[PDB]
Amino acid sequence: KPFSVPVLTVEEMTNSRFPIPLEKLFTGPSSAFVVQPQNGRCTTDGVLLGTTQLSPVNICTFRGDVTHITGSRNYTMNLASQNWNDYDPTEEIPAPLGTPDFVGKIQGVLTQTTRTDGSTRGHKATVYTGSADFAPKLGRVQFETDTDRDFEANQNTKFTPVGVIQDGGTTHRNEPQQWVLPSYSGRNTHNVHLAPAVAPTFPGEQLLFFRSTMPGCSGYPNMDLDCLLPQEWVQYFYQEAAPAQSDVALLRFVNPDTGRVLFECKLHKSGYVTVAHTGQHDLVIPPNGYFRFDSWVNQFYTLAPM
Amino acid sequence: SKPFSVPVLTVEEMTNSRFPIPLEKLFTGPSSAFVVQPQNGRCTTDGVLLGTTQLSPVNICTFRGDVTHITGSRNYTMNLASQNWNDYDPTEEIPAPLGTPDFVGKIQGVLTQTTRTDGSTRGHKATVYTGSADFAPKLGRVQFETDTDRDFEANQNTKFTPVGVIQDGGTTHRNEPQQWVLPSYSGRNTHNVHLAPAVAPTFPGEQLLFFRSTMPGCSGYPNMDLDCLLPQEWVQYFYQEAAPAQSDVALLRFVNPDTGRVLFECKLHKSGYVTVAHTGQHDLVIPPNGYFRFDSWVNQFYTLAPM
Numbered sequence: 233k234p235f236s237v238p239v240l241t242v243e244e245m246t247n248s249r250f251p252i253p254l255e256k257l258f259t260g261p262s263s264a265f266v267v268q269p270q271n272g273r274c275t276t277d278g279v280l281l282g283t284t285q286l287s288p289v290n291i292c293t294f295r296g297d298v299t300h301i302t303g304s305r306n307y308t309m310n311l312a313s314q315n316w317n318d319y320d321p322t323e324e325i326p327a328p329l330g331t332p333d334f335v336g337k338i339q340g341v342l343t344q345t346t347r348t349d350g351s352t353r354g355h356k357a358t359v360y361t362g363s364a365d366f367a368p369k370l371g372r373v374q375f376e377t378d379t380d381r382d383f384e385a386n387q388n389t390k391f392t393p394v395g396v397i398q399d400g401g402t403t404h405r406n407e408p409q410q411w412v413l414p415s416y417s418g419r420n421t422h423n424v425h426l427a428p429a430v431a432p433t434f435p436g437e438q439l440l441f442f443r444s445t446m447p448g449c450s451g452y453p454n455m456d457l458d459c460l461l462p463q464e465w466v467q468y469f470y471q472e473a474a475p476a477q478s479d480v481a482l483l484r485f486v487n488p489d490t491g492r493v494l495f496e497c498k499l500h501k502s503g504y505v506t507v508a509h510t511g512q513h514d515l516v517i518p519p520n521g522y523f524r525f526d527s528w529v530n531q532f533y534t535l536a537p538m
Numbered sequence: 539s540k541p542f543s544v545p546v547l548t549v550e551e552m553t554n555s556r557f558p559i560p561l562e563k564l565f566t567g568p569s570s571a572f573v574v575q576p577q578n579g580r581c582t583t584d585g586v587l588l589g590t591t592q593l594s595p596v597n598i599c600t601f602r603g604d605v606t607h608i609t610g611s612r613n614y615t616m617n618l619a620s621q622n623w624n625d626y627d628p629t630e631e632i633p634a635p636l637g638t639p640d641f642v643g644k645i646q647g648v649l650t651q652t653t654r655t656d657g658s659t660r661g662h663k664a665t666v667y668t669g670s671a672d673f674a675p676k677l678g679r680v681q682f683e684t685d686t687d688r689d690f691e692a693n694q695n696t697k698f699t700p701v702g703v704i705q706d707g708g709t710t711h712r713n714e715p716q717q718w719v720l721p722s723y724s725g726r727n728t729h730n731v732h733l734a735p736a737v738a739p740t741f742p743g744e745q746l747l748f749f750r751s752t753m754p755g756c757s758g759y760p761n762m763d764l765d766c767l768l769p770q771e772w773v774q775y776f777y778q779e780a781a782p783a784q785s786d787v788a789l790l791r792f793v794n795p796d797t798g799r800v801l802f803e804c805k806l807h808k809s810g811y812v813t814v815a816h817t818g819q820h821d822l823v824i825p826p827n828g829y830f831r832f833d834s835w836v837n838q839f840y841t842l843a844p845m
């Protein structure tokens with residue numbers, strides 16, 4: 233079975249790290265920090281990595297039951313799986329699938345249904361993923377809410393993410409920090425089973441990022457969110473499971489109107505993209521442009537500069 | 539001719555095409571008593587999108603645009619933009635903007651906004667009543683009820699993220715939303731246009747097979763059932779594959795890969811919906827790894843074995 237990538241434009245696709253559309257392509261240097269996202273991680277031959285799962289709507293969602301931290305508006309969620317089955321902390325993954333993979337304050341809504349009569353309720357909620365009590369790998373996360381009384385115990389509860397916040401009395405855009413992983417088991421613990429950090433290895437190359445802008449809900453947040461693979465590429469590679477014939481797939485970004493190649497890039501087998509560029513650059517692309525797999529190449533292939 | 543197929547995905551791995559939430563189960567029931575004409579999750583087997591259907595699972599029931607405050611209230615009117623912030627064209631031959639809600643109800647979510655000059659941001663609880671006289675997305679305007687009369691700015695990018703549905707608990711429980719009642723997309727006293735057709739089983743002993751989710755509820759006692767005709771992933775897959783239909787009916791088998799055995803067969807109609815041989819309302823009991831597989835194109839006389 234021949235390898236390929238989807239015929240989808242950037243704007244037709246979805247971020248693999250938050251449930252929002254892609255907007256644009258960005259490249260920049262990343263040697264000064266660690267790029268190790270856990271969502272949007274998949275090999276070209278269809279092996280899921282990190283905390284990656286298949287639907288974009290489940291990314292940064294939580295489900296479980298909640299208990300009230302009395303004397304506060306905070307609730308502890310005992311996590312369940314997406315289908316309400318028991319969450320198993322012994323599974324060899326860093327955290328439940330779809331767990332946020334950055335340190336920040338994610339605002340959304342906590343909803344709940346009472347099983348017996350079908351009464352429902354929803355409240356503004358924020359999860360601080362840098363919190364000592366953010367421990368999704370252990371099965372527990374804390375939400376700050378706008379109620380101290382309305383949520384019931386032992387009832388199905390869901391967090392739907394909306395956006396991110398920042399404290400405007402402090403330096404603008406200082407949070408979130410999209411490249412800082414949470415400590416998934418809480419303070420003084422070490423992460424396990426992580427998808428590896430990524431970096432270009434070839435001289436003159438940089439990572440190519442698939443970029444969105446997260447909604448902001450308060451203050452002056454850094455809303456940039458870069459994934460290594462569109463969620464649709466994760467979905468497609470998982471479906472196709474085409475064997476990799478080398479460690480590097482050469483892709484051309486093509487303008488279907490002219491048939492002209494705008495740029496070429498390397499799709500690495502372990503699931504990220506590099507380009508030949510030095511410096512920060514927002515790519516200018518025609519909106520109907522798309523990626524096309526042309527050939528498997530060896531470890532010595534030099535990309536045309538873009 | 540490119541061979542037809544459906545994705546190897548379990549039900550729980552897939553997504554509702556009518557609200558941005560996972561599928562939970564398969565359901566069949568009679569539908570002769572009401573009109574089944576959803577506009578999201580509509581696609582032919584050879585990949586032609588229909589109704590208000592588009593490819594993004596996360597854009598379903600989202601709105602983007604700019605907002606104007608309705609003086610003397612906590613309500614805002616959104617002037618709609620396209621999903622990529624381009625101008626919305628009301629003359630396009632579609633029922634409404636792609637992804638527009640396709641049922642009458644009160645959808646609660648959050649309106650968020652960024653001020654372009656300094657990156658200041660804001661978010662507020664918001665509800666859109668899709669049965670409202672001023673729900674007119676086809677014309678490019680929708681009204682949102684919020685918890686502020688002052689915080690949103692004009693001429694700034696504003697997004698509605700859907701969360702769930704509400705109901706008025708002082709009235710008969712589960713009386714809303716009404717998932718099979720289409721909104722009036724151009725507002726009060728208007729007629730919808732360019733609709734994907736209503737669907738019904740035609741064959742004796744057959745019913746629609748529905749891909750079912752439960753919408754989150756945010757207040758009251760809502761009817762949270764939400765049935766789509768196709769998983770969003772099947773829309774995405776047919777769009778990509780564009781495999782020609784060789785007849786009007788694709789026979790599918792629902793298979794348990796753990797055992798290699800067929801649990802039931804069903805018909806995937808070319809115009810994009812599924813029927814099974816069953817009478818009455820029934821939640822299907824399926825193994826967790828079960829999935830659909832294409833068997834062959836059949837003629838108009840093929841009879842399904844009872845489900």
Ligand SMILES: CC(=O)N[C@@H]1[C@@H](O[C@@H]2O[C@@H](C)[C@@H](O)[C@@H](O)[C@@H]2O)[C@H](O[C@@H]2O[C@H](CO)[C@H](O)[C@H](O)[C@H]2O)[C@@H](CO)O[C@@H]1O
Pocket residue numbers: 399400401449450451452658659660661689
């Ligand atoms: C949801 C809420 O009420 N949040 C407020 C903050 O206001 C939000 O963020 C500011 C920057 C602005 O975008 C508002 O539209 C949002 O509602 C508030 O931040 C201060 O708000 C004032 C204006 O009201 C100034 O713009 C300051 O620069 C902001 O720091 C903070 C602090 O008062 O309180 C809540 O978080």
Ligand SMILES: CC(=O)N[C@@H]1[C@@H](O[C@@H]2O[C@@H](C)[C@@H](O)[C@@H](O)[C@@H]2O)[C@H](O[C@@H]2O[C@H](CO)[C@H](O)[C@H](O)[C@H]2O)[C@@H](CO)O[C@@H]1O
Pocket residue numbers: 351352353354382706707708756757758759
């Ligand atoms: C968000 C909010 O406060 N909504 C309330 C309604 O309460 C919600 O809905 C009820 C059914 C329940 O699930 C609450 O936990 C929700 O917060 C409220 O409905 C009444 O709620 C009371 C209990 O507080 C009784 O259950 C009544 O039977 C419900 O009608 C309505 C009416 O008071 O007000 C807000 O919409």
